[PDB]
């Protein structure tokens, strides 16, 4: 069930952003800039062929605001890494300005009564994880939830920075590893006009506004 | 992030219905009522003060339905069971028809960073269940996540019926109780004329349609 208390990001970190899908309907992003949210990923596409029904018109409005914006993909245990990078280079354009790539690792459906072998997700990942470097030219954030972070991130991937899902708890990383993103709700509280109680997660980048603006630079 | 894909109950339950609260906007109960939910627990009272600004208006409405209708408390750590249980009476009325109460346990806010005692939960959640059994002379439902299970309600509460929150695997509990209801995703998804994707809980019953309409009773 639903609380009305909020879990609030620590005040130490100041850098706001949002992530959002076609699940948050039509999103004013002028008012989110209103916020100081200064971030966005949107959800573009999700295994090897689905593409997300607002991505498009998100895109192009996010990217219209001063907002830092980025895309993610929603990973697929069930196709190929490479299937699936292609399937985010078609649809996510190069912007020198952009935010990295996101690969968005957690369970679905009936997944986790089964779950994958930890040889087969770091097959496939490591494959979309270089595509995606090489093709954006900029480290990729992989975004976990804990158990999807134990079970396949942890003591893993070098190569990218992690995004994690703390919404109940201050964000910590079971092998000590430093995280770049912290989510900490999925209900995030909003004000300004149409300002209500909204499903929409918000996160916070690590560090401050200079190392921001250069973050993927 | 999101996936597109839904998880499922099992085929075995044909008996489904919803749990609401504010945040679930302006819900058309009869519109639920044509997709064959077969029940709603509507969040009435939070920790010993607070009433959702939309129990009043959904009580009323889910009530001119067919659908067996009750309501829930969602418990706070910080307030005693007694005032608690004194809140959610005074805001909810006895009907013979409505559905057993139900109390909420889970995690909120910052509370997970400093778990609350086992005792001290045993303590104030067994004076309300003491109350709202008296009270409405029905056997009080417990709802939990699996976390808040395995740490407060696991070797414990046989008096009650068990609510389990489940939505990426089936469901089962960590002592081998059986539960009564199971809460298996929290986007559940809806046809119909406003029909859409929405942020809205979808449960199951344990049993048949004449053990749904005796249940309680
Ligand atoms: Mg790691
Ligand atoms: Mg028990």
New binding site residues.
């Given amino acids: 069930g639903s609380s009305h208390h909020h879990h609030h990001h620590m005040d130490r970190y100041e850098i706001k952003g949002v992530d959002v899908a076609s699940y948050q309907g039509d999103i004013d992003w002028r008012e989110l800039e209103k916020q100081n949210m200064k971030f966005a990923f949107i959800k573009a596409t999700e295994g090897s062929a689905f593409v997300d029904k607002y991505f498009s018109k998100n895109w192009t409005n996010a990217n219209k605001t001063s907002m830092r914006v980025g895309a993610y993909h929603f990973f697929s245990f069930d196709s190929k890494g490479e299937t699936q990078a292609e399937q985010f280079i078609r649809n996510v354009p190069k912007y020198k300005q952009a935010l990295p790539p996101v690969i968005d690792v957690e369970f679905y459906a009936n997944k986790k009564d089964n779950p994958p072998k930890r040889e087969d997700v770091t097959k496939e990942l490591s494959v979309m994880i270089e595509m995606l470097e090489k093709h954006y030219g900029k480290k990729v954030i992989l975004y976990a939830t804990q158990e999807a ?1 134990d079970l396949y ?6 190569q990218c920075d ?1 995004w994690i899902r703390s919404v109940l708890t201050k964000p910590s ?1 079971s ?1 000590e ?1 430093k995280w770049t993103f912290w989510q900490y709700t999925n209900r995030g509280k909003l004000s300004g006009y149409n300002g209500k109680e909204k499903y929409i997660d918000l996160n916070v980048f690590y560090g401050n506004e200079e190392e921001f603006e250069n973050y993927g630079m």
Same sequence: chains 1, 2.
Avoid: E, G, H
């Avoid at 991130?153 to 070098?158: C, E, G, H, L, V």
């Fill in positions: 972070y991130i942890k003591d893993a991937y070098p992690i990383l092998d590893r």
